[model samples]
Target: MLDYFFNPKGIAVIGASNDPKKLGYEVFKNLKEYKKGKVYPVNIKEEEVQGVKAYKSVKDIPDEIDLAIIVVPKRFVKDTLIQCGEKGVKGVVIITAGFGETGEEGKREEKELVEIAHKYGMRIIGPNCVGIMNTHVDLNATFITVAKKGNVAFISQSGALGAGIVYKTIKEDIGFSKFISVGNMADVDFAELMEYLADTEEDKAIALYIEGVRNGKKFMEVAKRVTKKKPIIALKAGKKIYEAAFKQSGVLVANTIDEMLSMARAFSQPLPRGNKVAIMTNAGGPGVLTADELDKRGLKLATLEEKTIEELRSFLPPMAAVKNPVDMIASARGEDYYRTAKLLLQDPNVDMLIAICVVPTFAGMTLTEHAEGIIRAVKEVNNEKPVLAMFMAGYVSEKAKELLEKNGIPTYERPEDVASAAYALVEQAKNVGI
Candidate 1:
């Protein structure tokens, strides 16, 4: 049932239309970008939708559709689902609302759709939710599409929130491998997707915006197993939504939507081997703030060995702070950052890095030089360890951030954001085998 849901061989956009305001139109348009699958637009009123021939119903499509994207009216949902079952559609994404979220009557209607789907041995994604997307294969079945692809896989219980995060990631320069909007949860739910995606090699991190869980024990069992393979970060809303259970089961629960994304972005890179992090910065205030954040989150600051401090002092200026949360002074150059990082990586006590650059202009320090230095340091160290950068600059540090990200380093403007992400990496490392 999950086979063609991600990469359907043929898709039927039931209720697909030419109207721009209509969801059917946008979903049909988004699927056009997916050249791998054959697309059929189902609309009785039109002969074609944007050049693809339109069918009267799911039964009318000539080829076997592995997926059905339903956007029909509430009253028509049961009939559409029955036709889908008869036509042998393997999966369906019900983009239509007015189902369970409406009231008791609609809830009963939603249940009927699910019964029909199960009767044919097919899976349903939603009765009232946003569509699904497989960024890996360019399958943007969702009307709100994000073409960007990366290691973070997201599962959203709310369609609107999921769509917002997709756009937010694009703005923040982060990418997600898959984004599934599990609306109403008529059939396919969070635990099932987590269990399935945990085995795939496409993602290093899994993030979710959860409002509720269908099965607490099952989800906990799956979550604990999934965390051993990769990090699962989440933001659950409302009161008493299984917090203690999630933590004990190995899920890293985030305090806000912002932190949830920060954790996801951090896990986008390789995880560290331990919780020990060496903080390097050009300014003492930011460095102290970073140390405070890490400490508040229970992360240990790497204690520099005497030899590590000695080698660092040999190259650094006399005013440089050579201890952990190592400060290279406000006047430090890119090469100084490079030297500090190199010495830190060689330290047996250090397991991770947080390199801070405030983008020095008065001291003639360039972003490229600072980024290049840290990038070099990260590459030279064990590839299993993770390194992050707090690039506190606007307008000027864009290219520098690009260089850092291009070489596998995630950059943030705030120390708290960097700290939040590093916490996820540490959580993964801490629970990997134990």
Candidate 2:
């Protein structure tokens, strides 16, 4: 099943064309960029599409078509699947939307499509979806533009969010192992994907954008087990009180977006066993705010080791608070911040690193330079340990944010967000393991 979807030797893009506006053409163009397999663009209108010879139908494609991607209109989807079955294609990805999610007519079409798929012993990914991508195999089913491959495996029920994730992943230099936009989920559902990911060794973490779940018992059963083994971070869209509502209504519910994001972050990275987060800050107020939020999140302030404190006392000013929530005063420069961060990160008691740096308005120092220095140091010291930063002022330029993110440091607008996210990551990591 995985081979047909991810490692197929040949793929046929039905309804493909040379037009740049059409989704079919975009898939062919994007797949051509990364896919190592032989690509056949099936279209009756043209003899060739983007230079690849077009077949009249799936049957006309000479080579063994391991996967058939259907991008035609909803009415044509059923016939496209039939053609795939006739041609002995093992897997078919339906990127066409308007099925089950739109209205009754769409639901009818979705049912028919599923019936036909099962009749032919074929496995279908979606009746409505954006597509899928396997970074390891260089097989991208998405029409969205991709800059580079990543190691993260992202699955979203919303196509827009899935695309946004890919865009964000590219900008942040976060690699993805695979990506699936499971719109409507006519056949392959979330639980099945989770099970597959749990057993597969391809991805380090799994990130999901979920609106709702179809099967509650099965999802929780699998999730409970997978959470014990690997981190599963999910971003769910619903009310904060939804989890309780789900409990009363006999369904598994995620109460808030924060909870979902926390779960997703935990699943994606190693979470700290305890809430003891070592906070380092260049500003006093942000440090205070971070400490408060950490307390609220049940994260304990890590006790600085005597050696860690001794190391900081050497470089920091007398006014600098060298305790748990280490504050380096306004006078602490870029190198000072990095030195303090390196000490805290190396401490065995520290599970996660949260740093707050206000844009300093000094003659020789600037926000960008400080960010670069601090990020470089964090990357050097912390391996697989999550480091989050908060840039308080506008003086911290976009260029600096890019540098921090490029280095795998998740940056937030405020100090509290950094603390909250870091604690969440730590909690999830500790629960999920490395």
Candidate 3:
């Protein structure tokens, strides 16, 4: 049912315009740039939009169009939708608004629009929305930003927020598989997108910025089934009362947009096999704070066995703390950090590791050297467990942070953030194979 939305062979952009400033122009312009599809612009006002010939109506197109993008005004949307159905379009994205979220009259207008869509066997994405992006096809059928190819798919209700997320991800080098603005969800809603994406290997994790959802029980059930298949990270606005519902759905609720992306990154990587986390830090304060954060979230600070403990004692500095956190004292060099992480990864009691480094110039210990040590240590482990890094120094550790992420180890500036991600990963471990 959603084939055309992602892989349309031919697309008709209704309400396409020659005007340079309008959204219709941008959307049509972007669609024309797409490599995988044939683009037809639709508008009665002009014979040509930008460069492509404009069809007076969708029915005027000579061949079958897999997707129709409606950008007409509110008063003209119903008739336009009906005309699309009459033309046998398989899918549509109604980027026009003035429905549902507006007022009572708008609600009635949206209801009629949905009726026309279902009556004509067409699936609708929105009545008041921006647009969507399919990175695999390089289809940026939107007036806003398009997503880069990655393992996570993000769905949002607010266009502005969604736009920020898209631009931020692109700038930060974070990749995304798909992004949809499900505004006013008149026909297609969260459940439909979730079920569609659950079967795909392109996106292994799902992230959402939702205002509200319809059919509470149905949403929970779908969420539970999908979470069993792939992890979901969500940030619901102003719905603190439904904490139980979110928990029942098996979705990881993010407390903030920052946390949502961090959690999304964590989920995009591998899940931990157990709750035991081994923390290695060159600085004692951040490591202690990390320990407290883990305990606050009920994460078990991994207790190393006597053998692993003895090995650490032999390899680490005599003054280093070799307990759960396994603090390799300030004087400990990059090799010290490397050896500790390597030993912890092989520890049976340890499921994952969080290595913290505060790069200091006092002893000439470089962040690059420390990052290489951890990256080498991580590369040595041929397992599914993850090795996360916490680089507390701001500008000094930038290179190291980049190197760590390049090596598939997520690096964070804050201990709490790493703890939260670790907490979520640990919680997700139980249902990994289910």
Candidate 4:
């Protein structure tokens, strides 16, 4: 049912314009440049838009439209949506605002819009939202910049906040499969979107920014089923009422958007088989930090068996600690990381590993070697246990982080964020009983 919004054959911009400053212009420009679909600009006055022929209304267009984007002003939106409905367009994404979010009159108008939509059997994405995007098809219907394509399906209840997060992740190398802004949630809400995304191959995980939900029971039921398939990391901006409900439904609740994204990125790695986590670090500070966080989150710092300790003692420097953290000292090289990590992951006592590095540039060591060595070791172990990398050096480690993430090891900058990610995987594994 939502396929048309993602893979539309013909998309009509009901209020598209040629002016670059206008929102309608930007929306039309984005759709026109999309490779998969044919975009037509429907304007009341202009005969052509961006050098392409334009229609006076959606009903005036010659070809059939699978999706219609309504971006007219408040006074014009209702009539534009009616024209789109009359033209037999089943999918409508209303980019205009000033409905329902306003006072009583706006609420009454919003109710009429819904009534009018269902009368023509049309499904709407929003009346006060940013828009939707399916990166697989290059369908960037939103006014915001197109995001990097990846597996997470992000659905936000606020438009600007979602847009800002998109900007934040673009540089962090986090990608998204679909970006949906359910403004006012006039028609489509979180439950419907979650159910839709769960059935799709494009989304490996789902991240949600929830203000609130009207249908609590249905939302819980859908979330319970969806989390069984793919993890859903959600941040609730309102009170704690939904927090308990979220946990009861198997949804991973996050306190901040940063934590939400951090947790979402963790799904790239395999879920931990148990809560016993082993920490490996070149620097002892981050190792202790990670250990403390893991402990606070109820994850055990797996006590290494005598055999595993002896293996670590054999090769690691005498100055190095051969315990749970397995600090290999600052001088440890890439090969040493590979050897030590392989030794730790082989132990049946360890269910997960957090590999920490500080980018020893003073010793002329590059970030890539350490990241590469860990990547190889994880592959050598065949990824039986999940591994997370916390590379501390800021700008220099960007490429290394990208490399690590591309290779299925989620890299984080902070110990707490990485620990929270570890906790997410552990919790999700328990939620689904994997």
**What lDDT score belongs to each candidate, Candidate 1 first?**
0.84, 0.73, 0.83, 0.87
Candidate 2 per-residue C-alpha lDDT over 302-397 given as tens digits, one digit per residue, 9 for 90 to 100 = 887899989899889998999878988888777887788788888888777777778776868876776876787776785656677777656445
Of 1 and 4, the candidate ahead on TM-score is 4
Model 2 residue runs over 4 Å out of place are 1-3, 135-138, 147-151, 164-176, 238-270, 359-361, 366-386, 391-407, 432-434
Candidate 1, residues 1-434: lDDT per residue as tens digits?
A: 28577878998989899999999899999988888888899997998889777888889877889899999777788888888889988999999999899888888888887888888988999878888888888888888867477778899888888888889888777788888888899899988888888878887788989888889789999999888888889899886448888887788889888888788878757767778899998889988888899988899998999999998889877988888779888787877887888888778898888999888777566657888988877677645667888887886677888888777788888778899998878887778852
The pairs that clash in candidate 3 are none
Best by lDDT: 4
Clashes of each: 0, 19, 0, 0
lDDT of 3 by residue, 93-157 (tens): 99998899998899998888888898989999987888888887788889875666677788988
Residue-level lDDT of model 4, residues 349-372, one tens digit each, is: 998989998877768787688888
Candidate 4 lDDT trough over 10 residues, lowest sum: 236-245
Candidate 4 clashing pairs, residues 3+ apart or interchain: none
Pick by lDDT: 2 or 3, better one: 3
RMSD from true fold, candidate 3? 2.7
Locate the minimum summed-lDDT window of 10 residues in model 1. Answer: 376-385
Off by more than 4 A, model 4:
none
